Design an enzyme around this catalytic site. Sequence first.
Site, PDB file in Angstrom:
ATOM      1  N   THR A  57      72.865 -32.664  63.549  1.00 46.96           N
ATOM      2  CA  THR A  57      73.655 -32.067  62.769  1.00 46.96           C
ATOM      3  C   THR A  57      73.008 -32.946  61.112  1.00 46.96           C
ATOM      4  O   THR A  57      73.224 -31.751  60.148  1.00 46.96           O
ATOM      5  CB  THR A  57      75.154 -32.805  62.665  1.00 46.96           C
ATOM      6  OG1 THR A  57      75.106 -34.150  62.421  1.00 46.96           O
ATOM      7  CG2 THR A  57      75.367 -32.094  63.587  1.00 46.96           C
TER       8      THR A  57
ATOM      9  N   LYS B 217      69.926 -41.083  58.692  1.00 51.03           N
ATOM     10  CA  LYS B 217      70.185 -41.438  60.044  1.00 51.03           C
ATOM     11  C   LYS B 217      70.047 -42.508  60.668  1.00 51.03           C
ATOM     12  O   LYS B 217      69.857 -43.390  60.534  1.00 51.03           O
ATOM     13  CB  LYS B 217      69.085 -39.956  61.161  1.00 51.03           C
ATOM     14  CG  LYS B 217      67.855 -40.520  61.242  1.00 51.03           C
ATOM     15  CD  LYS B 217      67.074 -39.978  62.323  1.00 51.03           C
ATOM     16  CE  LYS B 217      66.729 -37.908  61.407  1.00 51.03           C
ATOM     17  NZ  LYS B 217      67.811 -37.391  62.314  1.00 51.03           N
ATOM     18  N   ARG B 218      71.056 -42.828  61.466  1.00 50.28           N
ATOM     19  CA  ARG B 218      71.080 -44.358  61.941  1.00 50.28           C
ATOM     20  C   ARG B 218      69.536 -44.375  62.892  1.00 50.28           C
ATOM     21  O   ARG B 218      69.162 -44.261  63.043  1.00 50.28           O
ATOM     22  CB  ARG B 218      72.269 -43.974  63.366  1.00 50.28           C
ATOM     23  CG  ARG B 218      73.780 -44.207  63.172  1.00 50.28           C
ATOM     24  CD  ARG B 218      73.900 -45.536  62.192  1.00 50.28           C
ATOM     25  NE  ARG B 218      73.892 -46.772  63.285  1.00 50.28           N
ATOM     26  CZ  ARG B 218      74.980 -47.201  63.616  1.00 50.28           C
ATOM     27  NH1 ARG B 218      76.380 -46.355  64.053  1.00 50.28           N
ATOM     28  NH2 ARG B 218      74.793 -48.179  64.594  1.00 50.28           N
TER      29      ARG B 218
ATOM     30  N   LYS C  33      64.649 -41.957  67.158  1.00 51.67           N
ATOM     31  CA  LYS C  33      64.883 -41.328  65.844  1.00 51.67           C
ATOM     32  C   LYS C  33      63.145 -41.292  65.819  1.00 51.67           C
ATOM     33  O   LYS C  33      62.825 -40.183  64.753  1.00 51.67           O
ATOM     34  CB  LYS C  33      65.897 -41.679  65.055  1.00 51.67           C
ATOM     35  CG  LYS C  33      67.423 -40.488  65.601  1.00 51.67           C
ATOM     36  CD  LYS C  33      68.248 -41.054  65.149  1.00 51.67           C
ATOM     37  CE  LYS C  33      70.221 -40.807  65.206  1.00 51.67           C
ATOM     38  NZ  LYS C  33      69.922 -39.466  66.118  1.00 51.67           N
TER      39      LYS C  33
ATOM     40  N   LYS D 244      72.515 -29.964  57.307  1.00 59.03           N
ATOM     41  CA  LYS D 244      72.415 -30.289  56.528  1.00 59.03           C
ATOM     42  C   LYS D 244      71.524 -30.285  55.143  1.00 59.03           C
ATOM     43  O   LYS D 244      72.022 -29.572  54.028  1.00 59.03           O
ATOM     44  CB  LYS D 244      73.319 -31.705  55.945  1.00 59.03           C
ATOM     45  CG  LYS D 244      74.672 -32.071  56.857  1.00 59.03           C
ATOM     46  CD  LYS D 244      74.752 -33.961  56.920  1.00 59.03           C
ATOM     47  CE  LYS D 244      75.997 -33.418  58.363  1.00 59.03           C
ATOM     48  NZ  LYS D 244      75.737 -35.677  58.217  1.00 59.03           N
TER      49      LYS D 244
ATOM     50  N   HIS E 137      77.020 -35.118  74.933  1.00 60.52           N
ATOM     51  CA  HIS E 137      76.423 -35.378  73.109  1.00 60.52           C
ATOM     52  C   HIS E 137      75.014 -36.798  73.593  1.00 60.52           C
ATOM     53  O   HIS E 137      74.401 -36.268  72.428  1.00 60.52           O
ATOM     54  CB  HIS E 137      77.350 -36.193  72.268  1.00 60.52           C
ATOM     55  CG  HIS E 137      78.559 -34.893  71.806  1.00 60.52           C
ATOM     56  ND1 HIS E 137      78.574 -34.268  70.631  1.00 60.52           N
ATOM     57  CD2 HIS E 137      79.592 -35.469  73.235  1.00 60.52           C
ATOM     58  CE1 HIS E 137      79.975 -34.448  70.943  1.00 60.52           C
ATOM     59  NE2 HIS E 137      80.647 -34.479  72.179  1.00 60.52           N
TER      60      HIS E 137
HETATM   61  N1  LIG Z   1      79.026 -45.249  71.755  1.00 66.10           N
HETATM   62  C1  LIG Z   1      78.604 -44.096  71.136  1.00 66.10           C
HETATM   63  C2  LIG Z   1      78.745 -43.376  70.184  1.00 66.10           C
HETATM   64  C3  LIG Z   1      78.335 -42.073  69.942  1.00 66.10           C
HETATM   65  C4  LIG Z   1      77.372 -41.821  70.964  1.00 66.10           C
HETATM   66  C5  LIG Z   1      76.440 -39.783  70.664  1.00 66.10           C
HETATM   67  N2  LIG Z   1      76.055 -39.200  71.732  1.00 66.10           N
HETATM   68  N3  LIG Z   1      75.819 -38.341  70.728  1.00 66.10           N
HETATM   69  C6  LIG Z   1      75.939 -38.791  70.054  1.00 66.10           C
HETATM   70  C7  LIG Z   1      75.456 -37.651  68.107  1.00 66.10           C
HETATM   71  O1  LIG Z   1      76.279 -36.452  68.928  1.00 66.10           O
HETATM   72  C8  LIG Z   1      76.143 -36.130  67.753  1.00 66.10           C
HETATM   73  C9  LIG Z   1      77.073 -34.569  67.927  1.00 66.10           C
HETATM   74  O2  LIG Z   1      76.731 -33.265  68.883  1.00 66.10           O
HETATM   75  C10 LIG Z   1      74.348 -35.250  68.799  1.00 66.10           C
HETATM   76  O3  LIG Z   1      73.884 -33.828  66.593  1.00 66.10           O
HETATM   77  C11 LIG Z   1      73.407 -36.649  67.857  1.00 66.10           C
HETATM   78  O4  LIG Z   1      72.212 -35.135  68.425  1.00 66.10           O
HETATM   79  C12 LIG Z   1      73.921 -37.296  69.509  1.00 66.10           C
HETATM   80  O5  LIG Z   1      72.801 -37.725  69.268  1.00 66.10           O
HETATM   81  N4  LIG Z   1      76.604 -39.416  69.723  1.00 66.10           N
HETATM   82  C13 LIG Z   1      77.029 -42.335  72.373  1.00 66.10           C
HETATM   83  C14 LIG Z   1      77.691 -43.385  72.326  1.00 66.10           C
HETATM   84  C1  LIG Z   2      75.431 -35.892  59.590  1.00 62.62           C
HETATM   85  C2  LIG Z   2      75.772 -37.520  59.685  1.00 62.62           C
HETATM   86  C3  LIG Z   2      74.970 -37.902  60.782  1.00 62.62           C
HETATM   87  C4  LIG Z   2      74.107 -37.761  61.234  1.00 62.62           C
HETATM   88  O1  LIG Z   2      72.091 -36.726  60.994  1.00 62.62           O
HETATM   89  P1  LIG Z   2      71.502 -36.817  62.093  1.00 62.62           P
HETATM   90  O2  LIG Z   2      70.456 -36.726  61.072  1.00 62.62           O
HETATM   91  O3  LIG Z   2      71.727 -35.448  62.896  1.00 62.62           O
HETATM   92  O4  LIG Z   2      71.624 -38.228  62.816  1.00 62.62           O
HETATM   93  C5  LIG Z   2      74.858 -39.643  60.401  1.00 62.62           C
HETATM   94  N1  LIG Z   2      75.188 -39.766  59.730  1.00 62.62           N
HETATM   95  C6  LIG Z   2      76.115 -39.883  58.113  1.00 62.62           C
HETATM   96  C7  LIG Z   2      76.721 -40.624  57.039  1.00 62.62           C
HETATM   97  C8  LIG Z   2      76.248 -38.238  58.476  1.00 62.62           C
HETATM   98  O5  LIG Z   2      77.001 -37.352  57.432  1.00 62.62           O
END
Ligand SMILES: Nc1ccc(-c2nnc([C@@H]3O[C@H](CO)[C@@H](O)[C@H](O)[C@H]3O)[nH]2)cc1
Ligand SMILES: *Cc1c(COP(=O)(O)O)cnc(C)c1O
Lengths: 810, 810
Positions: A650, A542-543, A548, A654, A351
Amino acid sequence: QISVRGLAGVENVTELKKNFNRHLHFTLVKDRNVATPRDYYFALAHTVRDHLVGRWIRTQQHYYEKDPKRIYYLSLEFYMGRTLQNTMVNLALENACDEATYQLGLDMEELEEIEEDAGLGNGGLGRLAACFLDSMATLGLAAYGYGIRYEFGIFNQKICGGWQMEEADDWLRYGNPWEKARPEFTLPVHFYGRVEHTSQGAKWVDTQVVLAMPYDTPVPGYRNNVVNTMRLWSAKAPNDFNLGYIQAVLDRNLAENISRVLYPNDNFFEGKELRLKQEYFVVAATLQDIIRRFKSSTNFDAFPDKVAIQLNDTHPSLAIPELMRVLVDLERLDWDKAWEVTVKTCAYTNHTVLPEALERWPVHLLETLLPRHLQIIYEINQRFLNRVAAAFPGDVDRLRRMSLVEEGAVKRINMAHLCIAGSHAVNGVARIHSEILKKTIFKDFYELEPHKFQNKTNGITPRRWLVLCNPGLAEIIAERIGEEYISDLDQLRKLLSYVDDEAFIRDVAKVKQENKLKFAAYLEREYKVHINPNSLFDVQVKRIHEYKRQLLNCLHVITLYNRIKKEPNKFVVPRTVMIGGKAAPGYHMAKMIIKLITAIGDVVNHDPVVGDRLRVIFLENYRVSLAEKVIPAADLSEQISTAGTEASGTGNMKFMLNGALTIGTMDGANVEMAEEAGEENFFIFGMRVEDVDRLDQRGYNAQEYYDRIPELRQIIEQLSSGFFSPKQPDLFKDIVNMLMHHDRFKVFADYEEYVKCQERVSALYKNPREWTRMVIRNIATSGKFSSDRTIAQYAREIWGVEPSRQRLPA
Amino acid sequence: QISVRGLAGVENVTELKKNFNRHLHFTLVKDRNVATPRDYYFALAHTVRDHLVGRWIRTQQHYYEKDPKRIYYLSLEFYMGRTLQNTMVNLALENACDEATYQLGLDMEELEEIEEDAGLGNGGLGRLAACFLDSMATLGLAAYGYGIRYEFGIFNQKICGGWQMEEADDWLRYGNPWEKARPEFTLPVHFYGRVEHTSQGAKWVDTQVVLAMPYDTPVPGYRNNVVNTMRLWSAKAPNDFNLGYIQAVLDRNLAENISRVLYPNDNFFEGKELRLKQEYFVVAATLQDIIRRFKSSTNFDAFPDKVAIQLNDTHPSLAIPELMRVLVDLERLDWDKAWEVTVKTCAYTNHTVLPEALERWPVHLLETLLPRHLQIIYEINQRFLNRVAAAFPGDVDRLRRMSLVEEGAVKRINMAHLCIAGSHAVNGVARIHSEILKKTIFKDFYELEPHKFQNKTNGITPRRWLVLCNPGLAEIIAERIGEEYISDLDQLRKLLSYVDDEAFIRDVAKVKQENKLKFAAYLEREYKVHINPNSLFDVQVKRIHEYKRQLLNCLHVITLYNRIKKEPNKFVVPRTVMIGGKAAPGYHMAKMIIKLITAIGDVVNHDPVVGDRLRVIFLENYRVSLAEKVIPAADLSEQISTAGTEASGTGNMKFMLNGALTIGTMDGANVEMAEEAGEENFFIFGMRVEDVDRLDQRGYNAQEYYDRIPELRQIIEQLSSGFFSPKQPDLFKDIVNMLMHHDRFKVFADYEEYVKCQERVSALYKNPREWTRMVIRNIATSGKFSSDRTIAQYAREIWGVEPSRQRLPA
Ligand SMILES: Nc1ccc(-c2nnc([C@@H]3O[C@H](CO)[C@@H](O)[C@H](O)[C@H]3O)[nH]2)cc1
Ligand SMILES: *Cc1c(COP(=O)(O)O)cnc(C)c1O
Ligand SMILES: Nc1ccc(-c2nnc([C@@H]3O[C@H](CO)[C@@H](O)[C@H](O)[C@H]3O)[nH]2)cc1
Ligand SMILES: O=c1[nH]cnc2c1ncn2[C@@H]1O[C@@H](COP(=O)(O)O)[C@@H](O)[C@H]1O
Ligand SMILES: O=c1[nH]cnc2c1ncn2[C@@H]1O[C@@H](COP(=O)(O)O)[C@@H](O)[C@H]1O
Ligand SMILES: *Cc1c(COP(=O)(O)O)cnc(C)c1O
């Protein structure tokens, strides 16, 4: 009231009322004269839960009898949000419950707001797991989600003086009516100890034991009477643990801390011992449960025919050496047979390509905590590198690059390399991301085993992310094309026939307007702030992360402010710019970005010359429940990561489903969204991946952009000189210094194109009919982004099982 | 089957079966094909609980409407045991539940055995609180029990190699179906901080806050439809507590440790900070709840008319200064008015004169933890001593003796002195004990305020301790005199008319024999040991303590063994000597006594010359559920404390009610039991209190007894020389050294009389008809020892309320 919410039949409503009163009296032990809204919420939750139970019991019986191949989805995160409404939607009970509550003198929407989010994830990765569970149940797969029941989920964010403060998310304080504790299926998990080698193999001895107690939560499919299980493990000390007396009892907390708290990092690796314990805890308990179920159907040859294990990133990667441990040390399979079984059972989803997010565990931690697993990892590595050497003779540097063991000051295990070696399939989460994996970080592995590498573009569930959060839109769609699209989202393409239909254009715009009024009212009630609901709602939720580029959005906001101050009496399209998201508590720059956003708001929102033409709002405590409110209200979706950094996204999906247009880079799934809708119906700007590579080769010099773009120079001078922080003029010097000298994400390089593209957005918003027609073209082509599509592809191409839309009997 | 268990009507049984199946399906989420006995237990518990709820809600409504004076019983301990059977007894549901379960193919007695004891006490003090709650509900008093919900109650005792080992009592592991969490009534409790003096009085500031969350448990009265509440507080950290991030969340445990574990000491004071926190926690939360309820009926003059607070020993003594704090600092009453209210509201029960059990808290602990309370205590002390000085002018030594503040190396607060000063009534718990209080430790206080001092002889509830545990005896009694005795135990005097009745003699002996067979079978099943059920069952069960003189019993056992070895072919009345009880984990001598008992058993039970004429059994894990099994089976009750040390005893009463004869000293309630039955029907031996005083004046010299009694010398030589510990000859030297040189409890001084009295026991046991006639005389005169009698006296003489036997409507 509305069709897609189901029937409110007289007998159904009577029965719901009776059971509500029964739970209020017997379950809650309240009379109506002292019951609060919270008591009423619980009485409704218990009433709805009773409708799940029969279906849950019979679904699990059906799997016992039929013995299908079982899918185990292993994740450290499940970002579930609230359960009440989703359950009603999936059981077709929403209108009946609304009517039953109305007749008791209660407003069901008010009761829904009392429920706590189950916040057991950080963002996209955790929320993807939640959408996936919903889709697996809807497609009739014998699927189990396995994770950790954190006592404290993602922290509640408070903003104090413009700064993020964290509070513990005590989500279980009032109880969780959805879970069922199963203390009878408690299993032991081992830590520490040492390995001794007998004549009958290795033995892991002198270990500390922690118990894993499971809690089961039902996962209902959409109107098919399937209810699958999410099983979350909680840590318990054994009763002889440390057994002066009083201290020994108090020290049980040391063991129980394993399941206490979710690590609150998104796209960042923190290499702490407690995190490693969490990762092993979930793997060790889950694998025993899997094997138990397999033996209750000697012959482990059939194991990969009855079991699939999907690893949600590397976080549960210890499943690979744990499965080997069990098969070799306990079941006494020969190494080669065990490895064959393991590889055919496991599959790995990546991911992220950000280097700071990849898990690389120090060998010394594994040596102490999991000494047998470290031995097994070394053996895997030696056998793997023997294959590499035979395929690429003499290529010594390739052997170094592909090793599971990284040399250095501190030796580390690269868990991603472990996952590739031990999995029959490796996938990325959007087409561009999967291509990046094959060209860059996993190039060597792709050359050795090209057949392993796949793509599975992400998706979102249209139950939660359309029907539940935007009933008005779901209904006007259903009026035209029926209800079948809710479990077959490709049917939204039928809406292209209504792009010139005056009534449909009117209804789409009306629903958006209603959602905007409702959201503007929510803001006034809960956060005492006034916004103009005729303005363009420009939303980035988003975070908070440098990649980002919330900072790029900030630069555009200040640009708009400065242009207004320069020509105050010129018309501009009014905007409400909303930015929300949590920063990880230890991520200083992310905390500074939040402060910058609130500081911009403090200036912009109180300037009388600006008026209601520009408002900047920081949305506090962004979480799943808040996403369900703000996404339906948005006009413009900001998806502006540097090309090559957002693996998929994602939130982007939405927004597309809910009638916002997208401004974004050609990154992650944005590429595929633009392809589906047509580039003419998307506001694409900025560097492509290839452009970012060209700049990196030449060297990124931010000073060049500052020197050439007067509007940008003005903003940087405002930041440096204390325009947005008069009492503390140097408050933002770290931000300025980063942007000018060590910006890994090239904010300035996309600034000009972003501003120009934002001007095109504003121009289109002035023509509401054409804006709405473009919206229709987006909603109509959003079908590919259903998680039902995603899961059907995993099922057929990775797990080797066929999805089904057939109903179990009620 | 048996009358006193109630009716099994067809509609009742049908309804119980239906609700059992409902709870199995909906509450437990099990089908019958995978349900275990534990699931069946829970399904029955939920079914029975449903019958309590309506009565609970309406009882609490009735108190709200009628606004009677409320009785608050404050205790650190509530030793409740199991709840299922007791609930069925009190609601008249036992036969119906038996029939319903039988028709479902289940044995209800087996299901009863699955329930965990609620072990939230150490022994007699905690169990008295439990009997009292049962009696207050049966007498229709508006009474509340307030305590702490310990996560771990009294430890489970395992015997390993003859030594006590402790294991945590994880009583909540499988859930507690009887409690209802009330997170909505959570209250703050303050610790640490400092006092600042404003112009508007003192303010306690900069405190740490812990939350007190209540859990409510129903307490049903006997067939009167009254259900009172026991409210137990659990400690929770606030959500901003310590708010790097991860450590702050993990450190919530520091606050939550307050309610983690019951201190496992009986008749011993351990002056630890965590214990003090527990004591304040329960007081502070309870008093806020009391005041809330009072205000929801400015005028605190009526407070003592609406509220009584009973202090169960000094453990909740901080109620006195806390009530003053609230009235003076928060409600702004003048000191004198506040003190008047406090004294009229509070009453204190003393349960021990042993000096090592009296709570004397170091001033430095109170200064740090509760600085405002220490100021208030000093002011109470100065005003109190001013009264003493006016009454006894010039008596400077009396001022020193009566002070609440003890001088020394470390200054301490004597909490018993605080309780006397701040209470309108002070009572002991048996006539001899109350007299001892007035003559010795509280003599000075009695001289100042003679009117405060009362006696309230203890009792036991005949629901749990006859009807529940000995249905066979309850039934044969009911056949003759009806059922009214169960709530009016004085009616047992009618049994004196049947002392010469051949059929009744036969039935009493038959019931005992049945109880003995059942218990002997229980031993074989659960602990793999064979006992002769025709032998005299000689039982001493109670906590292990030097004052209780398990060691004197040991000396008699060895004496019997030695006499058999001397004359093997002489007849002796066969005995099974059973001793059980827990030792506090830090009480070395008590742990050595347990080891001695098992060591004697190891020799005696394997000597072929002894045969089945003498067996010595250590009963493991003595607790309320085990008391309910062994007490009905006993022939001889050992109540052999040194005169002046057992304040009352309550096990003594349990044995009397259940058809055992008593061998005992003239100590505690034994005196009153002998008075009620007649001394001719009791086996009384040993020094009276006056004899102990005479020996203390002369000086106790244990060597004199050793030199004069050859049988005793032989035993001491056996202990010293390693006869009972061949592999470790010096194992018992600490015991020998204590007995010979520093025995505070004068074991040797009562040895000769005890042995002679035991010979009279054996002589009477040879004549079963006369033994049984004496038993009838004991059961028939046990009525005074009902806790219903005790509570009626508290009500009328202390609390100022009238008991009622009237039923609320069903
Ligand atoms: N601790 C930790 C916690 C989380 C992560 C981490 N790695 N990728 C993600 C997110 O997954 C989503 C679902 O596939 C992607 O849409 C998104 O682009 C991506 O940034 N989260 C990594 C480490
Ligand atoms: C969908 C969702 C995310 C992921 O958003 P991105 O714009 O793809 O980073 C993060 N947090 C919450 C609460 C969500 O519902
Ligand atoms: N921590 C602690 C814990 C407990 C105690 C304590 N003090 N007295 C008792 C018992 O109370 C019983 C009920 O009144 C009496 O029958 C019995 O004789 C007496 O020994 N328990 C003291 C300290
Ligand atoms: O031996 C059995 N007989 C009948 N049903 C079983 C048996 N073992 C498992 N099951 C079914 O499958 C179970 C599902 O839980 P699992 O044991 O976690 O797979 C139960 O809910 C049963 O319905
Ligand atoms: O304002 C009120 N109206 C009606 N009943 C009340 C009110 N306040 C308390 N009660 C009753 O008394 C309560 C008992 O709990 P308490 O608040 O702890 O005394 C509830 O169970 C109600 O039945
Ligand atoms: C009644 C009882 C006690 C008190 O017994 P004494 O002989 O009075 O000390 C102790 N423990 C348990 C489990 C009891 O039931």
